[PDB]
Amino acid sequence: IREERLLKVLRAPHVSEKASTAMEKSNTIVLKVAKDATKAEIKAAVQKLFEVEVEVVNTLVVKGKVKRHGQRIGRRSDWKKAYVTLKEGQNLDFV
Amino acid sequence: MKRTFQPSVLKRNRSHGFRARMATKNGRQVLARRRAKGRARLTVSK
Amino acid sequence: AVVKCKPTSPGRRHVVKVVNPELHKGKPFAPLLEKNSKSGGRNNNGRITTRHIGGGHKQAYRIVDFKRNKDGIPAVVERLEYDPNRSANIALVLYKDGERRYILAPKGLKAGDQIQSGVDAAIKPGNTLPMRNIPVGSTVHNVEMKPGKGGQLARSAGTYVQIVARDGAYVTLRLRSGEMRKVEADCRATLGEVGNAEHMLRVLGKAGAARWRGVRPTVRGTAMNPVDHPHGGGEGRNFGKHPVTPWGVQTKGKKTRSNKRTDKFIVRRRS
RNA sequence: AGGACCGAACCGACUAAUGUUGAAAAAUUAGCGGAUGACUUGUGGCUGGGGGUGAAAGGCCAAUCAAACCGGGAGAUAGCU
RNA sequence: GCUCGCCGGAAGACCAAGGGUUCCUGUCCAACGUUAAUCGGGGCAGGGUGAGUCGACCCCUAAGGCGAGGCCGAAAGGCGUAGUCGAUGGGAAACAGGUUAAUAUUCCUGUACUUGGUGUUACUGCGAAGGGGGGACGGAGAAGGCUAUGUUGGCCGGGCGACGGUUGUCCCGGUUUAAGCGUGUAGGCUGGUUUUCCAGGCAAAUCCGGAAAAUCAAGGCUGAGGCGUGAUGACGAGGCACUACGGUGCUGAAGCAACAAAUGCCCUGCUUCCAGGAAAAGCCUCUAAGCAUCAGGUAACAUCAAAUCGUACCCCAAACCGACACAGGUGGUCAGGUAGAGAAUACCAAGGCGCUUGAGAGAACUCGGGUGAAGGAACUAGGCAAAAUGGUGCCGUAACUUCGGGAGAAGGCACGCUGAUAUGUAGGUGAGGUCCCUCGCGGAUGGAGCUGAAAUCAGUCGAAGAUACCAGCUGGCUGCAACUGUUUAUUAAAAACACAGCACUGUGCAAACACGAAAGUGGACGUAUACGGUGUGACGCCUGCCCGGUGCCGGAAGGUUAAU
């Protein structure tokens, strides 16, 4: 793979109680990634950018909720969530 | 009792879906009329 | 074995069924089978072009050889089978070289019978040959109307054709309908008759039976409304007109045959 | 063996009452007919209005049918109110 | 929180469809919720859907669709060939336990499995869009083998109990454990093996089919379940510690046996019937073009890959279809106890609910019921509705009949409990032992335990023993229709329609006919014992007269007549 694509994959750390739970207990981190990225590219991109060892990447797609602002009905955008399993010898960095 | 609309997606889309219209002269005329009235959605699509 | 039923239920009463004990119980010969779909009597416009058809049990097309063109090579009769596609029974026969074909099962045929086809063949039932080599007056079935095309005439159970004349290129046949027709002598035919001639005896006894055979109910015209039929409603039971088909053409006696092509062949009408 | 018998699911609709600005634009309750077959039901397909389809009642074709629905001719015509 | 009550072949649990966030938490109460609402499927904010092995995708086709060329058609367009799509069908593989406020066959623990890619090694004739097998198929029936599952006993933990009695033949609870891997049983199917020839399988074939010898009798294929392992593991009543009283952590007994038993599996089997019961790919083999120490194939070990999308929640419904939080409608799956023929019914279990206005009063009248003196259809269009009948066994049963029926005709008799025959019988299952063995999931003997009808005799209670729910009213005469069916969705279910059968008539195959300006298609891959049309409508007895009228069929002599 090209690195240029990589740096475009990973949007953001996902923060929540489930997230923290897996991160502590099972050694796993949770990411909002570009809607189109795949398990290959996420494995690559973490292993590259955080420089730590990925075991496997499980993913899902979150359908955005439907909202009302001032009677108007909008739709929050979709996105993709990735549970990323780290091989155990790793210990977390948050930058 | 059993009413008239028993929904199905595959049915809905084969009957009225975009491609189904585009198949024929008449259908493309429908899609012409709609584009001319300026609808929000032409056909039934998800 | 044509047999009546003891009436254990009103339906079973009039039923006459024809049990041929000699028939093969168990599956046909697969490599000789085809897929067949029922049309509901409906053409490629989906309209009903022929009424009263549909339902019926599912059937598989047995591929029956009407050309009988594998020549001068003896073949022996392995077994008799039931063909759902037609009135008559059929035979599964084995040519010496290792080929099997289905044929129409003629009378006098049973497991073990040697038969054969070609110009040279002996005259005994179940043998086929071009007709100038057939004794005049002899009885035959599965007759072609054009050389090499395959059999068309007398394929039904018990039917047959008598050969009444040989003149030049044209033999004259007495057709089963009673009508004298010329056919060119170079068309192969098959000796004897079609078997299971007792097919016509069997009685259905109950509407359900007819419905298995793919036949749907038939509404008498004069029962319908004046819009649906020419025979039309009336108050109570009323007729008033000469009988016609649903499209208005006169029935009960009107000759509908029109061809000027095939005329030179037909000697005389049936009567 | 059976368009066999008794009988639940299942399919149907014979009577009675209630309901009739309904709990329901065709139901409910109590009984009633078929219930291994001409049965019943799921998914998909086919037949289109001077047509379909009809075990035929002019029934049925989107709660509209002795000729559907929608847009057009169209401001049809109306010695009638 | 406690009692009460309803559903339990559902008012429970899981899906598909359809919906699309309704899921879970916090927070709020205007509107929404037929009342209040602190509550909600309402408002606002946050969280939530984790897959090589579950689905979709994908591979393969059905009906049907589109359809290069092609045929046809004023134009648009119609039909269809090669193709290419199209699941409701065929196609590789994962299980038990643990965990969240909300996902889990996906996460975690353990234990596996499949298909591909590269690699090595050993061996090696590999190659297809062509060939052949396989895939691959109906209804009905039968009943033998089992399992899910349940009941009792043994076992283990606890219990001596608000009121007489309860250290016992007593009471309560648990007695759970999968895929996989090894084994090869009840059963089903089939002769086997070797050699020579034949060209039928569009060309080729060592494979299929055909023929001929030779030879052997066991051989192969299939197969539920059991047993073993999986598992010193898990789960496990409970107990011991702490607790924000919501839970967390540790510890952890027994964990067997007999019997009954499916509608599930063996079984796509077996027996029988006629109405004669999909296609294609993966899959196995044969070779043609070809390629030959290359390539490619076979096995073991290593190694990598298995992409993407769906996954929350509702689905007998307050979330789908009905304008509503609507007494309606919606396919598939699971199927506990006692009674019972039963998935009916009545009462309960697991589990879910009390149907989103109450509170009084206890008139007329309406609705849904219960009971009734004496009479018993006198009611009324009409016994409409109500009542009554109602079960199992045995006895009994008419005219008439197409000999089957009618018939459940009608009518009647016994029916509870307890004891004995027998401290539980007839049967059903079949342990221990002994013998045999081609030694095993074997055979015979064997009868402990376990289960368990029915009857007879004797006694006993009650007005009543088929005590409830449940569960035929019957008979006599006659119209019509033979019969089962079908019909006016939403006032008509019939005597109407269909019907098996009967008759007429058309039609020689490029069939009549039907749909199409045409091509084409149905009729039919049928062929006069076939096909269409009309009438009649089982069966039984029969179907009489009339050709003047209209019609149809035959005739060509004359008379008459169109274009030219």
Numbering used by the authors:
A (entry chain U): 2 to 96
B (entry chain d): 1 to 46
C (entry chain C): 2 to 272
The authors write:
In this process the emerging signal sequence is recognized by the signal recognition particle (SRP) and delivered to the membrane to interact with the SRP receptor (SR), where the nascent chain is transferred to the Sec translocon. In bacteria, SRP is a ribonucleoprotein complex consisting of the SRP protein (Ffh) and the 4.5S SRP RNA that forms a hairpin structure. Subsequently, stimulated by the binding of translocon, the NG heterodimer detaches from the tetraloop (closed state) and repositions to the distal region of the SRP RNA, where insertion of an RNA base into the GTPase active site of SRP and SR induces GTP hydrolysis (activated state).
In this complex, the NG heterodimer is in the activated state bound to the distal site of the SRP RNA, where we observe the translocon positioned near the polypeptide exit tunnel (‘Methods' and Supplementary Fig. 2). The SRP RNA is visible in its entirety, along with fully interpretable densities for all domains of Ffh and FtsY as well as a density for the SecYEG translocon, which is anchored by the SR near the ribosome exit tunnel. Starting from the tetraloop, it is kinked upward by 30° and untwisted at the distal site by a 40° rotation, adopting a distinct conformation with the distal region of the SRP RNA lifted by 40 Å away from the surface of the ribosome. It contacts H100 of the 23S rRNA through a loop that connects the G-domain of the SRP protein to its N-domain, which we refer to as the ‘NG loop'. Notably, the signal sequence in this complex extends 15 Å from the SRP M-domain towards the Sec translocon along the surface of the ribosome in the vicinity of H59 of the rRNA.
